[model samples]
Target: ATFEIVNRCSYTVWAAASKGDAALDAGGRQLNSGESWTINVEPGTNGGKIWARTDCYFDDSGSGICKTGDCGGLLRCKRFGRPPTTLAEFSLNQYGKDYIDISNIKGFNVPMNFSPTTRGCRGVRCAADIVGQCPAKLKAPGGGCNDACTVFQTSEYCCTTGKCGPTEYSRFFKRLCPDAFSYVLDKPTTVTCPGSSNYRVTFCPTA
Candidate 1:
């Protein structure tokens, strides 16, 4: 089902959620501390073990509910009963709107992603691998990230390294194509993707 949320903050706000999390506008409509927004949701598989997260970033270290955009990363795991009847709600503040504002949102369609273990099977760390050198492909859950580890050859999708001057690929990813840098995404992460992107693409509207 689809849902909507209202912006009840002072300045422009943002919002997001996880699985059973709520829907919010990233920088939820520039409402003046008393507005609203909206979103949608559907039953998730795997016993609805859906995870959601959202938050409003103030400068960098998100404080308050969401007063700029959707909370960039506020994760909240939820479980709706099978053949559901009752709906669960997540409140930013313990009380209703006592103090809630964020700059990011995560829930509808695309799920969030993240992982701190960005290291090679050789145990080489991504950060440690100079900015221009191709680091070993890291590993993660869901199987693909096995111990074998992929290599960065500066090819099409191959890992390109270095600042931007000269290395693999046409240009630089983390530097020039900073937006091109792919995330080792995982649960409890905010969906910072393209506007037309979503998680459940295979089943949602366009599916």
Candidate 2:
């Protein structure tokens, strides 16, 4: 499959991806508020996530850190990023189905949508002003918002136990993004697409 990643944000965002064993190079590329890039994802691949980094600076050596979603700070990610970020996750070509969804389980820094470019497929999104409405406890020191699991580090928030349930913070994220995974167990979750569909990951979409 292929993904057309675009930035509709008012500011620049560095797009990054972490697939099963192979990670995206270029530490992810910078999108200057309207730029787009094509990314290839092969079939039979699972355990994949795509995210955007904010407030990043990279020198000639392609090194620097993003205030949020900084993975390795190499302008290229070989692993999943830190918290306070939005992510689009996927699993493709498993019995002719593609499991696609968006998550803010680690908290949200940017608003985004992962949609099928082709028809007959549903889209997933986290298009909300989360930072502005963030609770005091989850508010990151540097501006981004963190998840309850990040702040409280409890079984209730982290779902470390089977008996855990949703909290007020999880409900808050749910109200904002109906299609995204607010907590580890969110409804209206992963949508399935055909193997034939391509995708588009847009940053800062209006829902």
Candidate 3:
């Protein structure tokens, strides 16, 4: 099915999508307010993630940086973006349906909504003003909010050795966006719908 990415913010967004080691739809595109771009992805495409880069500056050769979600400074990202990014992740057509979720587990840079185009499927969103509400310790140096793993770097927060539980840091994100993946142990974050259903991936839906 297709993924329709819509930018509803007042500012521009550099939209990016990738699957495994490959980039999709030439990797990235700049989207202005109210603009939308649709990209078709094959069924069963796994390890796909979609995100937005803010306050970006790219040269003619596509070498630059972003305030948030920089992908090794490449405009056509062949890898995952840096942390402090809002993510819409997918494992399409696996186990008969597409597994989708909005993740702030790596912390949040922008508000996002992931919804099926059809009616029955419930949308998952992390549309809270997380950047402003971010704790001082969990704040990124440039922009966006940092996760506990990024800030504290402890075994409990990072879940490095064994199964770890949520902390007050994860709870803050959970309270703000209950439907999103706030931490590694955050259950019920993922949702599924038929692979045939198209989706709307919106950025800054409430902005």
The deviation in Å at residue 136 for candidate 2 is: 1.0
In order, what lDDT does every prediction score?
A: 0.23, 0.85, 0.88
What is the lDDT for 64 in model 3?
94
TM-score of 3: 0.96
Once fitted onto the true fold, the runs of candidate 2 whose alpha carbons sit more than 4 angstroms away are: 25-27
- Arrange candidates by lDDT, highest first: which order? 3, 2, 1
Candidate with better TM-score, 2 vs 3 = 3
Positional deviation of residue 63's Cα in model 2 after best superposition, in angstroms: 1.9
Residues 92-136, candidate 1: write the lDDT tens digits.
212211111110111021111211111211110012111223222
Residue pairs of candidate 2 with colliding backbone atoms:
27-75, 27-76
Q: Report the C-alpha lDDT of model 3 over 1-207, residue by residue, as the tens digit.
A: 789999998999899898848887678888999999899887878989999999999999998999888898888888888889899998888877888899987889989989999755788888889989999999998889989987888998888877999899999999999999888877867887886678999999887
Model 2 CA lDDT for position 72? 75
Model 2 TM-score, all chains together? 0.94
Two-way lDDT contest, 1 vs 2, winner: 2
Best by lDDT: 3
